[PDB]
Amino acid sequence: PLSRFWEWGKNIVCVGRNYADHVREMRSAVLSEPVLFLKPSTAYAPEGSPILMPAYTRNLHHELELGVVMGKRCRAVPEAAAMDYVGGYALCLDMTARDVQDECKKKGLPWTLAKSFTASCPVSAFVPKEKIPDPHKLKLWLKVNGELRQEGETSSMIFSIPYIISYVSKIITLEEGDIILTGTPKGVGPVKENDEIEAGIHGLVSMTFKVEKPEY
Amino acid sequence: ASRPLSRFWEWGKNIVCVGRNYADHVREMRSAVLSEPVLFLKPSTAYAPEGSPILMPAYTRNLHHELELGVVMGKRCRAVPEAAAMDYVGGYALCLDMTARDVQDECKKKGLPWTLAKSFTASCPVSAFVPKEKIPDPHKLKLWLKVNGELRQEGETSSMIFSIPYIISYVSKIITLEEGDIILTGTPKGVGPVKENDEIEAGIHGLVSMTFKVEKPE
Ligand SMILES: O=C([O-])C(=O)[O-]
Ligand SMILES: O=C([O-])C(=O)[O-]
Ligand SMILES: [Cl-]
Ligand SMILES: [Mg+2]
Ligand SMILES: [Mg+2]
Ligand SMILES: [Mg+2]
């Protein structure tokens, strides 16, 4: 079932630079097409699993994002058909080792250690598509230890969800249960061991995660 | 329930790739080896088993072949020591890390992800599964690759800068590996372009071979 998509889904695709105010806080520039990177299936941390800090970062950031879960195999589809391939949604955190990412960008290296480590994708319960007639009218929020740190409106996305789906599908075929993370609004920032993150989509879902270090 | 490793590309979730693992490839790229292997990812839909085409992306004019040994995981592998790492291997496959090299040069220059260069649909042509029992030492293999009958790449897995047990241990500490995940262990020298309708043949001497046609989609 899609209600447990993180258990069997193979691929995670992430969009970068999709909120103008996040682009500004990063001091980057918006390109003509969305930036894409990948996370492995073992990046998923469903509720009840910890956010795990990698030992090689001293600057682990939260990033609040809407995930789009695919309901059917999606290969090179037009924008106008792209929503037909969506099964539903989930709220994700694109946990990011920001210090590692800065080095990767500077040296022209892959973004893997910065973005694609174990438990780098905390994920909410699945929200069926029927509950979200317009994914560009959602409000996202995130708290650390009870204090609000990120909020965003999906109406602020530079690239629309039907564009993202179509764009990704032409580069990488998407299977049933693959997710696309659609980028973070402004307000990214560090977390430390034992922080409690609470996050949600207003009116639809919330989730709580503890930041931990590996006990192995 | 469980599915056979003989068809790992059909159900396996993740592809992890090592960069800069053969000194003579590093030289031809004019790069440098770091203290640790470079890692990048491919999606499950990068897999092109025999009988499927290599698909050229529309956005490249310089699609390169890269000949690599793949290590297929047989058991869930989380943060394991080097000395235990081979216990987690199920077997092997020969892969091509198809690379849009023009796109990769731009990505490096702009500090962007290597995704469009490395991680597109059909970017991982893959041989038949070779069970671990047939390869007691994966660092004593000879790899070869032909384009239209002409030899273009050959390599010896003894030349790997980082060993397979090191790579598995290193990767497992960063990214937990599931049963049926593959690790591509890097290319020897001789990478080069292919064009539409080229025939690629490749093999591990004495163990496996495979043939792929280069096509454009639909
Ligand atoms: O680059 C990113 O990850 C983003 O914009 O969310
Ligand atoms: O960087 C690479 O792809 C390699 O060395 O195989
Ligand atoms: Cl990358
Ligand atoms: Mg995957
Ligand atoms: Mg992000
Ligand atoms: Mg390679």
From Swiss-Prot, chain A:
A GO CC term assigned to this protein in UniProt: cytosol
Localization per Swiss-Prot or TrEMBL: Mitochondrion; Cytoplasm, Cytosol
Regulation: Oxaloacetate decarboxylation is competitively inhibited by oxalate.
GO molecular function: acetylpyruvate hydrolase activity; acylpyruvate hydrolase activity; fumarylpyruvate hydrolase activity; metal ion binding; oxaloacetate decarboxylase activity; oxaloacetate tautomerase activity
Binding-site list for Mg(2+): 63, 65, 94
EC number: 5.3.2.2, 3.7.1.5, 4.1.1.112
PTM annotation (N6-acetyllysine): residues: 105
Co-factor binding comment: Requires a divalent metal cation for activity. Shows the highest activity in the presence of Mg(2+), followed by Mn(2+), whereas only weak activity is observed in the presence of Ca(2+) and Zn(2+).
Chain residues that bind oxalate: 17, 115, 184
Source species, domain of life: Eukaryota
Modified residues annotated as Phosphoserine in this record: 32
Co-factor requirement: Mg(2+); Mn(2+)
Keyword terms of this UniProt record: Acetylation, Cytoplasm, Hydrolase, Isomerase, Lyase, Magnesium, Manganese, Metal-binding, Mitochondrion, Phosphoprotein, Transit peptide
InterPro entries assigned to the protein according to its UniProt record, in alphabetical order: Fumarylacetoacetase-like_C (IPR011234), Fumarylacetoacetase_C_sf (IPR036663)
SUPFAM superfamilies xrefs: FAH
Catalysed reactions, semicolon-separated: oxaloacetate = enol-oxaloacetate; oxaloacetate + H(+) = pyruvate + CO2; a 3-acylpyruvate + H2O = a carboxylate + pyruvate + H(+); acetylpyruvate + H2O = acetate + pyruvate + H(+)
Entry's Gene Ontology BP terms: oxaloacetate metabolic process; pyruvate metabolic process
Tissues where this protein is expressed: Ubiquitous (at protein level).
Transit peptide feature, positions: 1-19
Modification N6-succinyllysine, positions: 107
The family this protein is said to belong to: Belongs to the FAH family.
Subunit structure: Homodimer.
Cited function: Tautomerase that converts enol-oxaloacetate, a strong inhibitor of succinate dehydrogenase, to the physiological keto form of oxaloacetate. It is thereby required to maximize aerobic respiration efficiency by preventing succinate dehydrogenase inhibition. Also acts as a weak oxaloacetate decarboxylase (ODx), catalyzing the decarboxylation of oxaloacetate (OAA) to pyruvate and CO(2), and as such is likely a regulatory enzyme in the TCA cycle. Also displays acylpyruvase activity, being able to hydrolyze acetylpyruvate and fumarylpyruvate in vitro.
Name recorded for this polypeptide: Oxaloacetate tautomerase FAHD1, mitochondrial
Organism: Homo sapiens (Human)
Gene that this polypeptide is encoded by: FAHD1
